[PDB]
Amino acid sequence: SRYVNLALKEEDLIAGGEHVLCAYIMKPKAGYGYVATAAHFAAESSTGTNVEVCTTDDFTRGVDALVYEVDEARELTKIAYPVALFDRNITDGKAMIASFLTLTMGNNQGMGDVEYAKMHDFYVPEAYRALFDGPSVNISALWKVLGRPEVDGGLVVGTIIKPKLGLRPKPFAEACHAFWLGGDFIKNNEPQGNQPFAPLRDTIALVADAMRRAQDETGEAKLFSANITADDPFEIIARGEYVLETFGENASHVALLVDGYVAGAAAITTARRRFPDNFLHYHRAGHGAVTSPQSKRGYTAFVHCKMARLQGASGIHTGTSDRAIAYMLTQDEAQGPFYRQSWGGMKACTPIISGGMNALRMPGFFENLGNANVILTAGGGAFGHIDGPVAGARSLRQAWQAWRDGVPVLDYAREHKELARAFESFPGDADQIYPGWRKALGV
Amino acid sequence: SRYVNLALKEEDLIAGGEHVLCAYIMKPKAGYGYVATAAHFAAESSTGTNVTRGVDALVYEVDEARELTKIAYPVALFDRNITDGKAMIASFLTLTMGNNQGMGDVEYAKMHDFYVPEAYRALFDGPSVNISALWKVLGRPEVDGGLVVGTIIKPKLGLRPKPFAEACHAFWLGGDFIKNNEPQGNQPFAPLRDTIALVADAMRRAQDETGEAKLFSANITADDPFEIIARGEYVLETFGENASHVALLVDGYVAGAAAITTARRRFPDNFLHYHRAGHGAVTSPQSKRGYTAFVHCKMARLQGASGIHTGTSDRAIAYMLTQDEAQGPFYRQSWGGMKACTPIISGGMNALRMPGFFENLGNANVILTAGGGAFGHIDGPVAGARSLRQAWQAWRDGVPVLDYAREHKELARAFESFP
């Protein structure tokens, strides 16, 4: 009713790359011809023309995204987008994500001849990929600040403390100094900012000052991740401006955490464009919604993060088509579910894992990943510690560190306390993974 | 335990106003408890604690059979403007359809209703300008000067600068708002500069072919709020004195909140048109998860979108978004003098079945940007929107359609036009 192209080779478009390739999981309502569903599905990704037509009755086709290949009973639909249908900036000339989603998960995700359609992968030529922002920093910049080679600097360990909201300016400050003590990265957690109890500038003013203190105490260079997430661009520069004013002396140490799935793209381009060489930290928030695996209309989690290496993000949560992510964001040259991609300059976006990541299974994380340059936010290997927080991530550093160098964790953990207590913290984790740990460690 | 206070009564959370009440359709992974898990979701919506509590967001109801969980959260949970001090959407979205949106323990949980109490909704932004700030330019009473008809130009892209223009004035000449669709902008075929210089022109030509004012929503949407800013200055500048006849559009769901809010506090004198779209990834009834579409366009005017896309409770949505002491699936809302953000009304409404909408909605005071209500008419989409103009006209004038088929030729021909 217009649209499609199946004679066309995926790897042609790949080459004279004046076109975006999208790959989806879509099943039609049931009683409609697959190609009809997908020649359609691309009508609302392109020109529409919505019937047949020609605009000024000139060839408003060569704008037109045509399904380049489909596998009916594999629930698959690959569509090739000409680059021209993509919006750029006027005072700028750059690509913007805001057009790439409106184009591919906009009206798209509403059609009635579709049941679900899930994006599984994408391809961004040269042409187009390079009209985009890219991570301004990475972990590199954190390596700069902690005094680690900005090439295989490695893991930043944190903690999270509890609770997410509640402690006050000072009950807060201090919790954070105390963990500044057995790790290096502390986040204000997603919700955290200007609640009445505990205010932005009362509380940013004292974390500020608890880093003078920890970083002065220990004599290591502690990093913070302060949330400058707002509705208005002006309150995201202003939240963040005072942050780096108040931090004065130490704003190389300050990161900029934004709740970016729940904020949006202009909130992430404010932090990234108005605060270019500061790390802007994305907090995928109310995003299960879509990316989570048994919701079938998302952008899949892998598709989420690829999307954010393109747009300025320096960091993003997880790892642990979801072990590919970790490659899709760091390596410029790597295979996603269907399409290999070139980053041909663009700078990683960092994997910033979490959770029950422990000390006995850390080393396996770092082998099946291969790079140990992730940011590890702990509640797990941390509060799980039988010697609490403080020593919970100071057993974490150990675990990673054992690893670059080459020492078998049961005996690295044989030279220091933090890691020999990990083993007596986790069951048999220590029984699963670590052969008779009871004998060769202590007991 | 510290997250369930079932038996701690809704009417009273709801007469206190420092408790933001959320209703959701939650369902546990197999084996897993109900209330237990029901209170688990509150803890990762609010206070964790994990290993000063007057702060934990609490469950006060369950339905298990009807499979819902009710969560009631304190108001000193929500982040704010260090600046202005006004309430914000970002971290609201962060707690209610925040982290619980990616749980383990839960199969899915879609928000179905929410209640923003006055000691928190007052704090919010709310619309600056609505549909009466269209009225005043169309020159109608700016108190129910009702139906604003408009259009949708196709194709959606592949259109050159002279082309849009040509087609906006020839659709302006005919009937009043044109909308720049979701992908139109600074694209290389039709670059916003060389094209908005030309819409300006459209309009000024049109209004001297009409003696009536034209309205153009321009997709001032970008993902750097200065671009956003830049296009507005540029378009209200270029429109010279005709710059009141401009609606700013933010293709809205896919650009954020941060997008929504710059365009409303950079140009709060012009119409922030919330283009929804993408909504449906989360917002479809197939999606067991996210927020629902009732929630998305009311969250929308608290943040004050001037008008959103609402095209049919789906006038559950047209109440709770228009009015003042509205209701909705589970909670009854008070906007307390906070402004009416109008339903932009979509699709196939035809010249013939609209006063049945108008009657069935209790009002005509919304916007239409029709397809074939108009496209399928005889004198053209031309007469095709003069038909709807006039659909309205008759309607509200409290005189019936059929009788005005005759006094007025283009609607006559509408019935006539089409089965």
UniProtKB/Swiss-Prot annotation, chain B:
The reaction(s) this protein catalyses: 2 (2R)-3-phosphoglycerate + 2 H(+) = D-ribulose 1,5-bisphosphate + CO2 + H2O; D-ribulose 1,5-bisphosphate + O2 = 2-phosphoglycolate + (2R)-3-phosphoglycerate + 2 H(+)
GO molecular function: magnesium ion binding; monooxygenase activity; ribulose-bisphosphate carboxylase activity
PROSITE patterns hit by this protein: RUBISCO_LARGE
Cofactor(s) this protein requires: Mg(2+)
Domain of life: Bacteria
EC category: lyase
Keywords: Calvin cycle, Carbon dioxide fixation, Lyase, Magnesium, Metal-binding, Monooxygenase, Oxidoreductase, Photosynthesis
SUBUNIT field: Homodimer.
Annotated PANTHER family: RIBULOSE BISPHOSPHATE CARBOXYLASE (PTHR42704), RIBULOSE BISPHOSPHATE CARBOXYLASE LARGE CHAIN (PTHR42704:SF17)
Protein name: Ribulose bisphosphate carboxylase
Name of encoding gene: cbbM
